[PDB]
Backbone:
């Protein structure tokens, strides 16, 4: 039932309802040779919507907004990028031009600027130390520590028990480390354990790329990270 690359033409976006008032958005992008999918999240926020992460690029993200407008028909008022890479902030300029308030931690904004990437406008305070959590409307934002990147955030929807791990969490089908150029391999397992300890009640876990699962995706990711380390 969950959308794969097979069902998503390049430049198109699919939505998938995870639970009441929670959706994931799925887009595709061509890396050198292969095509990769990418997940973000949509969370109902009263009569508005909170967006988690772009659809990886300007065209994809405009397609994302059109697909939201068509299927849910509620306005996207805020967006949060969960780290500084292009599959998370690429398309921020498109969101901004459409009247969406874009948000990221100062850590993420700093690293985006150094990378020459798009920079979310607003800053999320209170997330600078590992284990920090802040409320953002219908979600909790959590900084577990450095993992896939030094700034990576995860997002929990308490009304639906949905944990969005972004790129700090691997899908089960991924049995080898991905792009770890900006990762902290030494801290990644410790950061995953912080997620485990903070959200032991999570029922759905969404990786940055690929199929949703349960909390076993956390142990999976630790397994793969330790194998890469060694
Ligand atoms: Zn990344
Ligand atoms: Zn603003
Ligand atoms: Zn990623």
Residues:
């Amino acid at each position: 039932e969950y959308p794969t690359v097979s069902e998503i033409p390049v430049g198109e976006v699919r939505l998938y309802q995870i639970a009441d008032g929670v959706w994931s958005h799925i887009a595709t992008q061509s890396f050198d040779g292969a095509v990769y999918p990418s997940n973000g999240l949509i969370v109902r926020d009263g009569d508005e919507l909170l967006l988690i992460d772009t659809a990886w690029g300007a065209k994809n993200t405009a397609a994302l907004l059109a697909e939201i407008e068509k299927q849910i028909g509620l306005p996207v008022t805020r967006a949060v990028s969960t780290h500084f890479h292009d599959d998370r902030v690429g398309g921020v300029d498109v969101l901004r031009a459409a009247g969406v308030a874009t948000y990221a931690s100062p850590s993420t904004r700093r690293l985006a600027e150094v990378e020459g990437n798009e920079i979310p406008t607003h800053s999320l305070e209170g997330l600078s130390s590992s284990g920090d959590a802040v409320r953002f409307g219908p979600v909790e934002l959590f900084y577990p520590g450095a993992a896939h990147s030094t700034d990576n955030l995860v997002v929990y929807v308490p009304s639906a028990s949905v944990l969005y791990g972004g790129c700090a969490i691997y899908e089960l089908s991924r049995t080898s480390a991905g792009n770890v150029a900006d990762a902290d391999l030494a801290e990644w397992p410790t950061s995953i354990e912080r997620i485990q300890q903070h959200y032991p009640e999570a029922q759905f876990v969404i990786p940055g790329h690929g199929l949703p699962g349960g909390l076993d995706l956390l142990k999976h990711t630790t397994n793969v990270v330790k194998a890469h380390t060694n």
Summary: Residues 101, 121-122 surround zinc ion (ligand 2) (CB under 6 Å). Residues 49 and 72 are 9 Å apart (CA to CA). The domain at 1-230 is CATH 3.60.15.10 (Metallo-beta-lactamase; Chain A). The longest helix spans residues 58-71.
